[PDB]
From a paper:
AMPA glutamate receptors (AMPARs) are ion channel tetramers that mediate the majority of fast excitatory synaptic transmission. They are composed of four subunits (GluA1–GluA4); the GluA2 subunit dominates AMPAR function throughout the forebrain.
We next determined cryo-EM structures of the GluA2–TARPγ2 receptor under two different pH conditions in an apo state (in the absence of l-glutamate). As already apparent in the two-dimensional (2D) class averages, the signal encompassing the NTD tier was diffuse at low pH but was well defined throughout the receptor at pH 8.0. When comparing the LBD sector between the two pH conditions, we noticed greater conformational heterogeneity of the LBDs at pH 5.5 versus pH 8.0, which is reflected in the local resolution maps of the consensus refinement. Atomic models derived from the consensus refinements reveal differences in the LBD tier between the average LBD structures at pH 5.5 and pH 8.0, with larger displacements of the BD LBDs versus the AC LBDs in the pH 5.5 receptor. These lead to an approximation of the LBD upper (D1) lobes between the BD subunits at pH 5.5 and to rearrangements of their G helices (inset), which mark LBD conformations in different states of the gating cycle.
Numbering used by the authors:
A (entry chain F): 5 to 42, 55 to 214
B (entry chain B): 524 to 551, 567 to 671
C (entry chain C): 573 to 773, 784 to 825
D (entry chain B): 721 to 770
E (entry chain A): 623 to 720
Amino acid sequence: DRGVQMLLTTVGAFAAFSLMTIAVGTDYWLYSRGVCKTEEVMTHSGLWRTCCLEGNFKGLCKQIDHFPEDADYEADTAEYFLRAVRASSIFPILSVILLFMGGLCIAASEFYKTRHNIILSAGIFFVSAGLSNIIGIIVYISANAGDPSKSDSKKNSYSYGWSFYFGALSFIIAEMVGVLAVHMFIDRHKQLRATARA
Amino acid sequence: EIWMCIVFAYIGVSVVLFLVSRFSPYEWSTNEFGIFNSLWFSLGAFMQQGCDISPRSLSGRIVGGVWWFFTLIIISSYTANLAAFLTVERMVSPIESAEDLSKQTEIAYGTLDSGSTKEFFRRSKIAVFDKMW
Amino acid sequence: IFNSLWFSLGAFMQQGCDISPRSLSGRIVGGVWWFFTLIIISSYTANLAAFLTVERMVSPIESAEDLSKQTEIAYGTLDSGSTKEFFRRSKIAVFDKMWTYMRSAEPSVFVRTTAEGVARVRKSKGKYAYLLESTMNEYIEQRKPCDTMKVGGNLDSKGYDIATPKGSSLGTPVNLAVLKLSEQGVLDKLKNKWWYDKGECTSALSLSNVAGVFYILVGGLGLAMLVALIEFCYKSRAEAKRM
Amino acid sequence: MKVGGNLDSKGYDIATPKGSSLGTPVNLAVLKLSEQGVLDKLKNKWWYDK
Amino acid sequence: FLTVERMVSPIESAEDLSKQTEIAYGTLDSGSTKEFFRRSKIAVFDKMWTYMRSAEPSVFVRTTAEGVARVRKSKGKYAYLLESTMNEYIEQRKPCDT
C-alpha cells in the first residue's frame, strides 16, 4: 500500500538521520587507553575529543589531535591526505547532509504529487548517504590503525562503542529506505503507464 | 573490521545494482535485477559461484566489475593470510611485564607468605606495586 | 565491441559469463585469455602468500647472540673505556666473536664518544647498533625524539658506588644508608623520577591492507550511479522535446 | 619461563666476621673475579651449560 | 605443507648438529675421539662437549660396533661421531642405511 510504504520510508529515514547525527556527535566510538590533555587510562575515543574513563582525571574530554607533529615528520603525501580527510570528518558529515536532503525530498514529495522525480532524488540521496557512511567508516578505521592504542587488538583489546554501532546501524537503515524509495518511484511510474493505457 | 566492511560493501553493492538496474522507466522489466535478485547476484559473485543473470547496462556492468575486482582481491588475501598463518607458528606470551599483570585480572599472581618479596610489595611507593599489592 | 569487453572482464575476474564464444576464432581467443587469467590470478595469490609468510617469519634482534650471528647490522663499542676491555678479555664464546668482528671491520665501528655514536645509530636508519651502559641506554630511550630503543638484557653486571677515601669515619654510615635507601625503595623511586617520570616518550590482515580496494569499489559504485543518472536525464530530455 | 625485567636490584655477598683479616682480601677477590668474567663463566656453567 | 617441506634442511656440518638438540650425538666412551672434545676450545667443539659431559641418558658408547648399531636402531634420532676412514667403510657396507 502507498500509505504504509510512505510511513515506513519516512520513519526509517528519520531513524537513520537521528542515528547518524547521534553517532557524529557522541564520543563513544572506540574504547582505548590514552592520555588526557597530552597519565594513561581507559578512555572512550570519539570523533573530535576523547574523555577519560575510570581515571584520576575522569571526565576530561581532551580533543583528538589528528596531526602528531611532535617529531616534525611528513612521510608520504597519502598519509597527510588521509589525516586531513579524517580530521575534517568530511564523509560522516556528508552522509548526515545527504540523509537530511533525502528526508526533505521525501517530505516535499507529498506536496508535489505530480512530480515523481523527487522520490527518485530522495532514493539517490539515501544511497549516496550510505556510500558516504561506508567511506567514513573505512577512513576512520584506517586512521585509527596509525596509533598503537587504537590498534593491536591482541594486547590493547580496543572495543567499539555504541556510537560507532549507531553509525553502522544508520547505514543499514538508509540503504533499506533507499530500496523502498526506488520501489515507490517504480510503482508511481508503473501506475502512470497503466492509467495511460486505459 | 574487514568482515564488517565486507558485509557493508555487499549490502551497498546490492542496493546500487538494484537501483541502477530498475530505476529508469525507459528500461521497463527487461532485466531481472530485483532487490532479492541483486542480493543473490552479489552473494554469488562474492563466493565465486557464478550467476544465473548478468547485468546488461553500462552502469550495472560497472557495478559488477568493481564488485568482481573487490571479491578477487579479498578472497586472494584471505587465502594468502590463512596460508601464512598455517605455515608460521607464532606463540606469544600473554604477560611480559609487571605492569601488565596489574592491568589484567584473569591471571593470578602471588609471592611468599613470609619473605623479602612480601615486604617489597607491602611497603612500596611505585604506582605499579600498590596496584599489584 | 561492448559485449566483448564485458566477456573479457568477466573472464579475467573468473566470474559467471552470460554468453560464451561459439566460433573457432572466438573460442581460441577465449581459451588463451582463460589460460592467461588462470596463470596471473594464481601468481598473484602465490606472491601475496609469500609476502605474508616472509613477513611473518621476520624476527627482530633481541639478544646479543642474535646480533652476533647476523652481519647485516653493524655494531661497535667506544674507542676506549671498559667496553672494549670487557670484550677483549671476555672468554665467553658469544662475546669474543663480537670483539673479533669490531677489530677487523671497515668502516671503523668504534666512535670517538657517545654523543655522535648515538647519533650514528639515529642516522643509520636501523643499520647500526651501539653497545653502552644500560643506565644511559634507558635515559636516551626516554628523550626526544624517542627513536632509539633498548633490547635484550645486560651482557654483564656492574654497579655504581659511593666513593669514600680509605680510612674515613663516613665509610660505614654511608654504606648502611645506601642499603637502607634500597630496602625502603627510595633509590628505585629516584631512578624512576629521573628516567621515566621526567621522560619525554596483529597477525590478521587489517583494513589498512585492503583499504584501496574498498575505495575503488565505492568510487566505481559512484561512477556507475552517475552514468545511470546521466543516461536517465538524457533520455528524459530527448522524450520531453519529442513530446 | 621468565618474562620481563627485574623488579628491583639485589645482590649476593660473601659474609665475613666484623673486623676480620679476611674482610679486605675477599672484597678484592670478588671484584677481580668479576673483571675477568670468572663469575659470568661460573654462572653460565651451572645455569645454562648444565 | 609444501613451504615447510621446502624449508626442511638436514644437518650437514658439525655446527648444524651443535645448534639443534633433537638428534642426539655421542662418541666412544674412551679414546682419542673423547679426548679431542675435552681439550678443545673452539666455539663449535666445546659447545657440544658441555652437552656430551652432562647428558641423560649418556650419549657415550663403549664400543664402535654398538655405536653404529644404536644409530641404525634410533631411526635417525641418534648420530655417531667417529673416524672418517671407518665411517666411509661402513657407509659402503650392507644394508647401506648409514
